[PDB]
Design a protein around this ligand. Structure first.
Ligand SMILES: *C/C=C(C)/C=C/C=C(C)/C=C/C1=C(C)CCCC1(C)C
Ligand SMILES: CCCCCCCC/C=C\CCCCCCCC(=O)O
Ligand SMILES: CCCCCCCC/C=C\CCCCCCCC(=O)O
Ligand SMILES: CCCCCCCC/C=C\CCCCCCCC(=O)O
Ligand SMILES: CCCCCCCCCCCCCCCCCCCC
Ligand SMILES: CCCCCCCCCCCCCCCCCCCC
Length: 218
């Protein structure tokens, strides 16, 4: 498991860079008024690229620092909400949702960090999990409520964005509890890495697809 985990870190590192530069290269494919979300998606992948280089070296050393993962999450998760909420809101409604979801994400990630750095299976470990879970469900329920009146191609493209988050973010709580299901400390890191690739690169691709639709492309 240890060698597999290192290799996945190294592959994911190049994957995040590839997501970054692909998304930048693809920005010319959409109208200029819809390129902001593609650029923000590239920034998300670029921040992850930076932290993934650190995580792979950290894992390779044998003294791994999950703080690298959690600081990447605390920066990138609110950024991912910036473009999701732009589809459905502007002005005051947008500013309120971006702030409130970003606060919730920070609580979720901070609670997860508190629990993950505690003894596995301890009351502190479960406290972090439960607080993070409740905040996560609150975020998902808010996300499900967004864009209810949308129709047509834009509604389909937004539902694809929503479903990627609603399904793909489930991997994180699974990874967090992997160490208590078995001798699976490394499996937590495997699942987190797979999830980050799927969720970061995947959301960027779907945001690009959202921009094509908004550009009037078929
Ligand atoms: C780019 C990175 C992303 C989108 C990371 C998202 C991570 C979360 C949704 C993790 C949430 C957690 C729980 C729901 C419970 C256990 C603790 C966490 C922080 C792993
Ligand atoms: C804790 C410090 C985090 C360090 C983050 C470093 C990330 C830099 C990676 C590449 C970013 C490039 C993404 C492009 C930015 C938007 C494109 C644009 O503005 O035209
Ligand atoms: C128990 C609920 C906790 C609520 C958290 C409130 C704000 C916490 C913000 C997020 C911190 C996550 C990043 C910390 C990792 C870096 C630590 C390190 O590098 O050593
Ligand atoms: C383990 C890995 C499981 C990954 C699950 C990913 C779920 C993707 C949800 C929806 C994606 C929608 C794509 C729109 C394409 C049209
Ligand atoms: C370290 C503490 C981080 C707290 C959250 C920081 C969020 C930064 C990204 C904000 C994007 C726009 C809302
Ligand atoms: C392991 C493979 C998981 C693939 C998930 C893809 C989600 C984003 C699709 C974008 C098109």
């Amino acid at each position: 498991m240890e060698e597999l985990t290192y290799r996945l870190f190294m592959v994911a590192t190049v994957g995040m860079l590839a997501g970054t530069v692909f998304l930048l290269a693809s920005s010319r494919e959409v109208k200029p008024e819809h390129r902001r979300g593609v650029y923000i998606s590239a920034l998300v992948c670029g921040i992850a690229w930076y932290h993934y280089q650190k995580m792979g070296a950290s894992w390779e050393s044998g003294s791994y620092d999950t703080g690298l993962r959690y600081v990447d999450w605390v920066l990138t998760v609110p950024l991912m909400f910036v473009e999701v909420l732009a589809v459905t809101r502007k002005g005051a409604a947008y500013n309120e949702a971006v702030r409130n979801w970003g606060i919730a994400a920070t609580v979720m990630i901070g609670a997860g960090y508190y629990g993950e750095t505690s003894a596995a299976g301890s009351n502190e470990y479960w406290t972090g999990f439960v607080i993070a879970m409740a905040t996560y469900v609150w975020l998902m329920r808010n996300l499900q409520a967004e864009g209810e009146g949308l129709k047509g191609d834009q509604a389909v493209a937004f539902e694809n964005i929503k479903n990627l988050i609603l399904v793909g973010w489930i991997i994180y709580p699974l990874g967090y509890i992997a160490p208590v299901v078995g001798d699976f400390d490394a499996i937590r890191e495997v699942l987190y890495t797979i999830a980050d690739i799927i969720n970061k690169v995947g959301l960027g691709v779907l945001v690009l697809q959202m921009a094509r639709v908004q550009s009037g492309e078929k």
